[PDB]
Design a binder for this molecule. Structure first.
Ligand SMILES: [Mg+2]
Ligand SMILES: [Zn+2]
Ligand SMILES: [Zn+2]
Ligand SMILES: [Zn+2]
Length: 1190
DNA sequence: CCGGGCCGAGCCGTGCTTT
DNA sequence: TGCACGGCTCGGCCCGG
């Protein structure tokens, strides 16, 4: 099976997990906790997760064998059949069987990670068609959490319900027309008043869907809005069913393609209507002129990403505008899942709005990505204040020259993986000329002419190197260097021209200017001026002449200076002369044949076409495909704290005040009345909210109370009574409203842990669970002492943005080679022994690289855990850390905010960025996509000691974010489906570049380029992956977004508009400000309409009155009444809006809207705030009065 | 010396909508 | 995508009559 390294890796991981689990089990046995054992079982594959989460017991082996035999979908269907026939045990009525089968099937088809089977499916019930035939059918009730599951999960739930209804021998749902009207109205109102829904079903589609769904999709109410078609038969509510309508909109409708694919694979009949719906939904010119025409015909610009711009979030490029982001096909070391590659220079030169991990909304491949530094690609070309043009391909140069920038001519490159085009099914765009194409042409031409076999990006035999160098008359060392790293070693321009002359290949892409960005008439005028009024110095190299310098005066150059800037030619202006220096004089004069032939404009021809037709040295289009993007959602790395911060899960009520301070209530002697669980000692008879009796140190028993007669029974007594009151007749409850004196409890806790010096200790107003079991106060004291905070289930968590990585360097993460060899790494990614810190090593699937904020916080968490173990439990310390670098080799838990299972990872290094780097398999095993998502990490021992299932809220969305099970091993076969499209090749073949020019589809050449899916099953899914582009440093560049250092809204808008003004391909003046105004106008108009219909509230109480009390004071107390929508909330964005209107070009519609909004704001308060104040000076150059008087 | 003026934390509420 | 903005109270310190 697996080789002798992956097995050792997984064995060591299991050994460490066992080492932690032993201590966690030993500590929990002493009885100071809700349970006497750990409450997080460990799974290993999908069957274990499904068995632990939904059951029924014993299903694991059956799932295993069925998956081995048939597959995934077929195995799910056979499991459903076996459950229905009753192999795993008798359950009860048909409803129980239906619920169990649907839950297990939805868990199997999902791989048992996301909590849709546990949370979304609230209930399954059988209903009768009393309106038509009195026949039976099946219905599904969807709760609130189903909106977080995803379209695939929702659609698969619908399909599983259909299959179970078919196999139960039940009839079809037959809706009345009023049902259709009610559902259409529900969808429309939900979109209008709640959310955008990210999908708009047309009413015809909704009617068709209702007419052709064999099950009833309903549920409880999730929004406080009534409907019109009330009292519909079979419906027990008259409010919005958000879960059901969201399922219907974003499931079967938004993801019909995947649903019909699943139906075809699954062999399910009766869904032909969906298949039909899906199939209905589905002269002498120049080469480059025709290519541009076909590009514009087939692939069309998209504006969806730029339909809205928030104040403070800049737009970096208009849709498919030349001068924006240059598209490059490839995958870097730390990109590929859904992220982009960006040079740090263009991160700096946009006022540092972009930072490592900052999300942005893209146009072509998908929608959204995360930026990552790649120093191997090109940067911006900028125009300075004195008129010079520079190529800022370097980070330090960008820092140096930042203040002199006048305009950004070109914005730089963006590396996008080929697997991102396959996943989103996007037509391939023609590829800009690059070094990774030139090197392939070079080696192919060398082989064709001289019959020498060489290969880029690797090491070749010495005989071939010597033969090629003898033929080409070059240094063999330089040939080896260039073939090894074509992206960093470039020949001098004269050598490039000599290569083009001899071998017959286009010019090196580094020395090609953007010729096709100008018209041939501009080049005609420029050629005339160069021939007439220029002084050029020539040179020689192997009989090849080339220019060395051009000096032409500014007046003689005239208005053709703009042409030199559009070609991206670096020059300088001195004492009236424009000077073009050595490397960039031949880059301009060689294509034009050194003025030997006359450039002449032609119709239906492009500049490169004319150059190729007339010249001997040939060229390729260097910029033809451009991309647009827009900023959104800056990067994040911060701890998790509840809406009011909490340090212990202990209810205090109103005694503690506004901050729920337990210590303040204790020090004032207050007595609080709250609902808690009381425990009673069997031997002596102590009573109170504690798990151990202080008198004797023995475990107590929970007390059960009668809701009607308040009779208390111990757990042993209530066990026989079947948890029902014999004297009364009501089901018991474990909690009742009781009285507590905080002083005694706090003093006992302080004496217990010897922690007396704590200032504040926050609790909760009321426990949300059904048991209302409280937490020990000693844990709260230690958390307060060590400055950490608690979560809803008792764990301490840290939230960060996720980014991918496959290969690392021992110096980027600050780890010595000896430590790495101790961890288990012994070779670099090419087979050589690991001896240096500059070699590239490959990352094992479950190794993570934390940030430094995360390390700083986890140091406090580890200190708290050590204090807990030493003081509360009386056991030796575990971590023993004094610096963040002492946590290396310790295990964490990763958890997405919508799943119920975790995955174990290992710490190996730290970076100085606000992102969480990890393997692509690690992020996919949490059902995450890596284009803006944020997840959590917690120490394994902390979760083991602290997590409990008795602190979980009792509503439906209470089991989300909880590690009910953890996975110990990684299986790439059952992680996700988007990560199966990634690339594992060192370089793209020549066929890919040649096929991009034909505008093919990525499905045609899916076999040419190796992907992850091509390796599934075989042992080398963990073994060898590769990348295309290298990086000097993985965390180089700005680290914090500038958006987080601006306070006012006006300042944000001004900075964003300056940024938009600098960039050439944005066109701020009329679209940026207008689309921005369509973000402040909703705020203004929507706050004036809520001032005239608002509810009032009391300062002391929380009582809300829908109309003001007519005595002016709170009827139930003595406090005063305050508004909920103040007067200053309406007109907070009025000044910025007026500035935007008066400064920039907006259509008269928006200007009139703003003027009338101001007039309406000043007219509603006409007789409550009269203008009794005169003034000295008036007319501050306003715009409203000017518009009125004009 | 004893009484105010003032800051700095905290905790609440709110973000287009034809008849 | 949700966060970003306004307003009310309540002590802890100066600083002055
Ligand atoms: Mg995502
Ligand atoms: Zn006792
Ligand atoms: Zn009773
Ligand atoms: Zn009141």
């Amino acid at each position: 099976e697996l080789p002798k390294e992956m097995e050792e890796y997984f064995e060591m991981l299991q050994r460490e997990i066992d080492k932690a689990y032993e201590i966690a089990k030993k500590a929990r046995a002493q009885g100071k906790d809700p349970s006497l054992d750990v409450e997080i079982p460990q799974a290993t594959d999908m069957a274990g997760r499904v068995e632990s989460l939904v059951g029924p017991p014993g299903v694991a082996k059956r799932i295993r064998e069925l998956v081995k035999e048939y597959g995934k979908e077929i195995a799910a269907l056979k499991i459903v059949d076996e459950i229905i026939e009753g192999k795993f045990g008798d359950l009860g009525s048909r409803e129980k069987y239906a619920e169990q089968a649907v839950r297990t099937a939805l868990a199997i088809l999902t791989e048992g990670i996301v909590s849709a089977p546990i949370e979304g499916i609230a209930n399954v019930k059988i209903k009768r068609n009393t309106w038509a035939d009195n026949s039976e059918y099946l219905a599904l009730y969807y709760a609130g959490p189903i909106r977080s599951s995803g379209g695939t999960a929702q659609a698969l739930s619908v399909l599983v319900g259909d299959y179970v209804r078919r196999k139960l021998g039940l009839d079809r749902f037959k809706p009345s027309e009023k049902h259709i009207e009610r559902m259409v109205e529900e969808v429309d109102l939900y979109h209008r008043a709640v959310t955008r829904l990210q999908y708009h079903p047309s009413p015809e589609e909704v009617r068709l869907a209702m007419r052709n769904i064999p099950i009833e999709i309903t549920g409880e109410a999730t929004d406080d809005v009534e409907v019109s078609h009330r009292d519909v038969p079979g419906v027990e509510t008259n409010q919005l069913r958000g879960g059901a309508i969201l399922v219907l909109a974003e499931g079967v409708l938004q993801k019909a393609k995947k649903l019909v694919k699943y139906i075809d694979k699954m062999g399910i009949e009766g869904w032909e209507w969906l298949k039909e719906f899906v199939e209905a939904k589905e002269v002498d010119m120049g080469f480059y002129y025709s290519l541009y025409q076909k590009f514009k015909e087939e692939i069309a610009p998209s504006d969806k990403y730029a339909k809205e711009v928030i104040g403070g979030r800049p737009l970096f490029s208009d849709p498919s505008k030349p001068g924006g982001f240059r598209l490059r096909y490839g995958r870097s070391r730390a990109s590929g899942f859904a992220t982009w590659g960006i040079n740090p220079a263009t991160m700096i030169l946009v006022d540092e709005f972009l930072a490592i991990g900052t999300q942005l909304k893209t146009e072509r491949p998908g929608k959204g990505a995360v930026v990552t530094p790649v120093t191997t690609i090109e940067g911006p070309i900028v125009k300075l204040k004195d008129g010079s043009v520079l190529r800022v391909d370097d980070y330090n140069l960008a820092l140096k020259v930042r203040e002199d920038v006048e305009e950004i001519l070109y914005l730089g490159d963006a590396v996008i993986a080929f697997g991102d085009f396959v996943e989103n099914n996007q037509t391939l765009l023609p590829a800009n000329y690059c070094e990774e194409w030139w090197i392939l042409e070079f080696v192919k031409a060398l082989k064709e002419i001289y019959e020498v076999h060489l290969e880029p990006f690797t090491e070749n035999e010495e005989e071939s190197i010597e033969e090629a160098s003898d033929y080409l008359e070059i240094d063999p060392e330089f040939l080896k260097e260039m073939l090894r790293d074509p992206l960093r070693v470039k020949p001098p321009v004269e050598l490039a021209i000599h290569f083009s002359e001899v071998l017959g290949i286009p010019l090196h892409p580094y020395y090609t200017l953007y010729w096709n960005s100008v018209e041939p008439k501009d080049v005609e005028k420029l050629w005339r001026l160069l021939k007439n009024y220029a002084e050029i110095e020539w040179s020689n190299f192997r009989g090849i002449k080339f220019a060395k310098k051009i000096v032409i005066s500014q007046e003689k150059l005239g208005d053709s200076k703009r042409t030199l800037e559009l070609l991206g030619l670096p020059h300088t202006v001195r004492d009236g002369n424009v000077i073009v220096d050595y490397p960039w004089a031949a880059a301009l004069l060689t294509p034009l044949g050194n003025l030997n032939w006359e450039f002449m404009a032609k119709p239906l021809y492009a500049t490169i076409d004319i150059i190729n037709e007339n010249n001997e040295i040939k060229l390729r289009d260097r910029g033809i495909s451009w991309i647009g993007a827009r900023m959104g959602r800056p990067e994040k790395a911060k701890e998790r704290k509840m809406k009011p911060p909490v340090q212990v899960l202990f209810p205090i009520g109103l005694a503690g005040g506004s901050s729920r301070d337990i210590k303040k209530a204790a020090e004032e002697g207050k007595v609080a009345e709250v609902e808690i669980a009381f425990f009673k000692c069997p031997k002596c008879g102590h009573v109170g909210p504690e798990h151990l009796c202080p008198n004797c140190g023995t475990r107590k028993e929970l007390l059960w109370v009668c809701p009607r007669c308040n009779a208390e029974y111990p757990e042993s007594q209530a066990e026989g009574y079947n948890y029902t009151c014999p004297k009364c007749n009501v089901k018991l409850r474990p909690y009742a409203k009781r009285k507590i004196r905080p002083s005694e409890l706090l003093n006992r806790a302080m004496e217990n842990v010897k922690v007396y010096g704590v200032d504040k200790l926050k609790g909760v107003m009321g426990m949300t669970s059904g048991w209302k079991m409280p937490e020990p106060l000693e844990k709260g004291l230690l958390r307060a002492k060590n400055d950490v905070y608690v979560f809803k289930d008792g764990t301490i968590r840290f939230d960060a943005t996720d980014a991918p990585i496959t290969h690392f360097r021992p110096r980027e993460i600050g780890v010595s080679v000896e430590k790495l060899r101790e961890l288990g790494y012994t070779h670099d990614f090419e087979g050589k022994p690991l001896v240096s810190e500059d070699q590239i090593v490959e990352l094992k699937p479950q190794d993570i690289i934390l940030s430094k904020e995360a390390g700083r916080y986890l140091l406090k968490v580890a200190k708290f855990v050590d204090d807990l173990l030493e003081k509360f439990y009386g056991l030796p310390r575990f971590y023993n850390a004094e610096k963040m670098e002492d946590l290396i080799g310790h295990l964490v838990i990763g958890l997405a905010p919508h799943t119920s299972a975790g995955i174990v990872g290992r710490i190996i290094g730290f970076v100085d960025a606000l992102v969480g780097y990890a393997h692509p398999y690690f992020h996919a095993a949490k059902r995450r996509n890596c284009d803006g998502d944020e997840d959590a990490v917690m120490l394994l021992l902390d979760a083991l000691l602290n997590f409990s299932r008795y602190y979980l809220p009792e509503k439906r969305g209470g089991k989300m974010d909880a590690p009910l099970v953890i996975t110990t091993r990684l299986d790439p076969r059952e992680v996700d489906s988007e990560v199966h499209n990634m690339d594992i090749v060192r370089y793209y073949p020549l066929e890919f570049y040649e096929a991009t020019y034909e505008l093919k589809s990525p499905k045609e050449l899916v076999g040419v380029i190796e992907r992850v899916e091509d390796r599934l099953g075989k042992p080398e899914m963990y073994y060898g992956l590769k990348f295309t582009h290298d990086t000097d440093d993985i965390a180089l560049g700005p680290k914090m977004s500038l958006y987080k250092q601006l306070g006012d809204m006006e300042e944000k808008v001004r900075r964003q508009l300056e940024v938009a003004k600098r960039i050439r391909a944005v066109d701020e003046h009329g679209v940026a400000e207008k689309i921005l105004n369509s973000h402040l106008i909703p705020d203004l108009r929507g706050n004036l309409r809520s001032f005239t219909r608002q509810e009032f509230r009391c300062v002391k109480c929380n009582t809300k009155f829908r109309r003001p009390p007519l005595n002016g004071k709170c009827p139930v107390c003595g406090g005063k009444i305050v508004l909920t929508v103040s007067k200053g909330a309406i007109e907070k964005y009025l000044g910025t809006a007026k500035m935007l209107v008066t400064e920039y070009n907006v259509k008269n519609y928006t200007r009139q809207r703003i003027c009338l909004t101001e007039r309406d704001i000043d007219s509603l308060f006409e007789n409550v705030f009269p203008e009794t104040q005169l003034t000295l000076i008036v007319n501050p150059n306003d715009i409203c009065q000017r518009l009125v008087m004009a």
